[PDB]
Amino acid sequence: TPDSIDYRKKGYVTPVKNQGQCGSCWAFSSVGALEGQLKKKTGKLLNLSPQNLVDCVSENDGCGGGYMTNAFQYVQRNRGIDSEDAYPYVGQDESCMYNPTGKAAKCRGYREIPEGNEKALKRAVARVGPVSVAIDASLTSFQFYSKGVYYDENCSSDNLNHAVLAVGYGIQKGNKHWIIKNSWGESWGNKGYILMARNKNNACGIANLASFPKM
Numbered sequence: 001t002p003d004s005i006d007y008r009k010k011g012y013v014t015p016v017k018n019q020g021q022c023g024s025c026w027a028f029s030s031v032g033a034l035e036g037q038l039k040k041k042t043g044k045l046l047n048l049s050p051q052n053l054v055d056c057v058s059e060n061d062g063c064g065g066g067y068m069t070n071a072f073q074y075v076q077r078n079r080g081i082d083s084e085d086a087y088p089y090v091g092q093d094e095s096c097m098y099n100p101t102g103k104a105a106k107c108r109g110y111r112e113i114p115e116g117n118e119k120a121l122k123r124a125v126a127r128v129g130p131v132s133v134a135i136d137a138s139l140t141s142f143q144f145y146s147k148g149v150y151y152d153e154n155c156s157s158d159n160l161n162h163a164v165l166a167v168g169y170g171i172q173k174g175n176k177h178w179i180i181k182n183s184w185g186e187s188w189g190n191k192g193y194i195l196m197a198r199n200k201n202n203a204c205g206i207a208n209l210a211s212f213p214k215m
């Protein structure tokens with residue numbers, strides 16, 4: 001297991017997106033994970049559609065929030081998810097309009113990382129690829145993050161309110177971190193990314209609700 005890895009450099013990560021004023025973070029986190037596995041299995045990197053999930057996952061609440069596991073389960077039973085091109089993102093709750101002719105991938109279930117275990121999360125990222133994770137992103141310090149490894153003692157490990165994508169991990173100036181892809185546009189953080197403290201007692205609850213799809 002490498003001490004550092006960045007899947008962006010391997011071509012497993014699509015450009016940073018902007019969810020807008022819709023609580024669809026769970027959909028973006030879910031598609032990012034699927035995009036990573038699709039690349040690993042087919043060699044092709046394509047943008048999958050979060051709107052497909054927002055509109056069709058009946059177990060989630062669309063722009064009102066949802067779980068990534070429910071998203072993977074929908075893709076499995078639906079036997080597919082459309083490409084962004086075939087089901088563009090509008091940031092609004094609308095009726096399910098899944099188009100089978102636009103299917104770009106599918107999945108056959110998901111696996112969850114044991115709750116609170118950052119070590120298992122590290123092993124998963126190294127062996128499988130990008131992993132979907134949930135965190136507390138309610139702090140002002142998070143909203144205005146600009147550089148360095150983020151850590152705020154005020155972050156809650158129990159108040160999970162946002163979903164992002166762990167695309168790697170490493171160390172910066174002696175501080176271990178997780179490389180996180182957010183969905184608030186490129187103008188946020190460091191070109192849409194944030195480095196979050198790793199092995200600092202599950203900061204912000206990073207390993208409390210992690211999962212990845214199986215293909």
Ligand SMILES: *C(N)CNC(=O)[C@@H]1CCCC[C@H]1CS(=O)(=O)c1ccc(OC)cc1
Pocket residue numbers: 022023024025026059060061064065066067134135160161162163
């Ligand atoms: C993202 N922009 C909005 N946040 C979320 O959807 C959170 C993702 C991680 C897990 C917790 C979500 C918030 S919630 O606990 O209020 C929620 C969970 C499940 C839902 O429906 C099934 C709806 C909201």
